[PDB]
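Private note to self, pasted from the team thread so I don't lose it. Backbone tokens:
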């Protein structure tokens, strides 16, 4: 059972341009209202020498508000949970891959994340930490390969004007077989509500809701 109020714990192990790091985080939110907050701490490899914005979207699809007629594939996957794999192709060649495992333990969600950050130019917006958060987007959701897929055109604002884009592709698969929905949209807004000077402590807020195609 997914209650109206739910907490989660997350751990992320990753590598960006050969720099290894680990992140721990805890958060809470309203799974049916589609809102959540998270506080993340860099526990190893801190301070990170690249943009926090490449990581922010990797820190929770069970917290999506869904209309009653769209099956909630990821909520229906519980208690066993689900997994997801993502690819983010940045405009300058930079690539980020993520694998995730989500489960339920003692009434709380547990997230395990693994991240690869490859071929980012040393003078680019990520390496130079020139990003300023992301704009509100819409993930096009659709079934494919006995799984739910999602597509986003992520836009990161830059400090001195303009944007830095990525084509994001994700596959979400329930551990046990559950009813796949038809295509729909998931509108999101993710905000960095607070951070310390070196980004070793970061607070995030996100709202997500499902709408008919």
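Design output:
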């Amino acid at each position: 059972i997914i209650k109206e109020f739910m907490r989660f714990k997350t751990h992320m192990e990753g590598s960006v341009n050969g720099h290894e790091f680990e992140i721990e985080g805890e958060g809470e939110g309203r799974p049916y209202e589609g809102t959540q907050t998270a506080k993340l701490k860099v526990t190893k490899g801190g301070p990170l020498p690249f943009a926090w914005d490449i990581l922010s979207h990797q820190f929770s699809k069970a917290y999506v508000k869904h209309p009653a007629d769209i099956p909630d594939y990821l909520k229906l996957s519980f208690p066993e949970g689900f997994k997801w794999e993502r690819v983010m192709n940045f405009e300058d060649g930079g690539v980020v891959t993520v694998t995730q495992d989500s489960s339920l333990q003692d009434g709380e969600f547990i997230y395990k994340v693994k991240l690869h950050g490859t071929n980012f130019p040393s003078d680019g917006p990520v390496m130079q930490k020139k990003t300023m958060g992301s704009e509100a987007s819409s993930e096009r959701m659709y079934p494919e390969d006995g799984a739910l897929k999602g597509e986003i055109k992520l836009r990161l604002k830059l400090k001195d004007g303009g944007h830095y884009d990525a084509e994001v592709k994700t596959t979400y698969k329930a551990k046990k077989p559950v009813q796949l929905p038809g295509a729909y949209n998931a509108n999101y807004k993710l905000d960095i509500t607070s951070h310390n000077e070196d980004y070793t402590i970061v607070e995030q807020y996100e709202r997500c809701e499902g709408r008919h195609s």
